[PDB]
Amino acid sequence: PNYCFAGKTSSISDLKEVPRKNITLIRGLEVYEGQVSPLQVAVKTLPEVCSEQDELDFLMEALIISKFNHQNIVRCIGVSLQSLPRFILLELMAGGDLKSFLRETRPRPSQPSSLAMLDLLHVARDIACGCQYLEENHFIHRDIAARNCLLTCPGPGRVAKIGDFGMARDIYRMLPVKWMPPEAFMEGIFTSKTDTWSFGVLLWEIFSLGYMPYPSKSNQEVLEFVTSGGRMDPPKNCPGPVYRIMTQCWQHQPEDRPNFAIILERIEYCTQDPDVINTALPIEY
Ligand SMILES: COc1ccc(F)cc1[C@@H](C)Oc1cc(-c2cnnn2C)cnc1N
């Protein structure tokens, strides 16, 4: 089984196999926190009880992640496929996944400024850079969403990175309906503009502080809503310029939507506008 990315073909043999003795599991997080000799790592494990397909899936996932080279995509430290159970070793992202972080770190009476608008813009900017990298390398992610993003740490130095490529893995060889543009439902045509649409939904998730998109709508209701021109309202307290980026991401015609270079440019503008970043987030009770 080969994998083609950018200007290079690669196989299992090119994967950096780490001697099993050098790998220690520290605790569960099927993922564990681990150590390699000392590098902190996350360990994704393939269950020994699985089918042939699970094994090629696991292998293709390792190939995919191992070929990426960008600071906003989680690194693959290596693999251990010659011992059971098989491991994929990933950069350990201590802040956890983005969706959970937004829900746990919402401004509250016990910590009214735990998070501010600039923090959310930096996360959006980080993922957008990741996405620009995928775009310019002609890789379509297909599942951009907060559940698939990770943070290096809880505190103010945090960096957001794209952390899961399972959907792209399957496609290479379960539509995330609420993150999908109209043409995906009706034409099944996918483009980097597909990711642009998803990023807009991700933006909404971020600035809502981790709400489910289209609150109160089922998948089919969303599908009909969006196909007929409907769009989400801004998240509570969302700055007008940030909502504008979302709605630009959600233009009905793919070609009307910005590429990620333009998105990054507009997020930076937002970061430079004091009227945006001086906006307070809602305090939750
Ligand atoms: C549930 O796992 C995921 C969820 C979403 C993703 F995008 C990637 C992963 C997995 C494959 O990767 C990591 C997980 C964590 C983590 C999660 N919760 N706490 N921690 C400490 C840290 N670093 C990773 N590399």
CB 58 within 8 A of CB 67: no
Pocket of ligand 1 (CB under 6 A): 29, 31, 42, 44, 74, 90-93, 96-97, 148, 150, 163-164
233 is in an annotated binding site: no
99 is in an annotated binding site: no
**Side-chain half-sphere exposure of 228, counting CA atoms within 13 A:** 6
At position 213, the amino acid (one-letter code) is P
280 Cβ partners below 8 Å, 6+ apart?
116, 117, 237
Query: What experimental approach yielded this model?
Result: X-ray
At position 110, the amino acid (one-letter code) is S
Q: What torsion do the CA atoms of 111, 150, 270, 71 make, to the nearest 10 degrees?
A: 130
170 is in an annotated binding site: no
CA atoms of 73 and 93, how far apart (whole Å): 11
At position 75, the amino acid (one-letter code) is R
Domain 1-92 in CATH 3.30.200.20: yes
Q: In three state form, how does the secondary structure of 184-208 look?
A: HHHCCCCCHHHHHHHHHHHHHHHHC
Tokens of 32: 């564990």
Strands of 23-28's sheet in order across: 23-28, 31-36, 39-45, 87-91, 76-80
CA atoms of 107 and 282, how far apart (whole Å): 7
Task: Kindly report the length of the chain.
Answer: 285
Gap from CA of 96 to ligand 1 centroid (Å): 6
Nearest residue by C-alpha to atom 8 in ligand 1: 163
Tokens of 173: 């060889």
Q: Which fold has domain 93-273?
A: Transferase(Phosphotransferase); domain 1 (1.10.510)
CB 101 within 8 A of CB 151: yes
CA atoms of 253 and 244, how far apart (whole Å): 16
Tokens of 191: 């483009």
Q: Which of the listed residues 35, 93, 123, 161 should we mutate to test ligand 1's pocket, taking the one with most ligand atoms within 8 A of CB?
A: 93
Nearest residue to 239 via CA among 191, 265, 273? 273
Q: Which of the listed residues 25, 26, 27, 31 should we mutate to test ligand 1's pocket, taking the one with most ligand atoms within 8 A of CB?
A: 31
CA atoms of 136 and 114, how far apart (whole Å): 35
Angle between helices 192-207 and 117-136 (to 10 degrees): 170
Q: Where are the domains of the chain?
A: 1-92, 93-273
CB 54 within 8 A of CB 44: no
220 Cβ partners below 8 Å, 6+ apart?
none
- What amino acid positions are annotated as catalytic residues? 143
SS3 252: coil
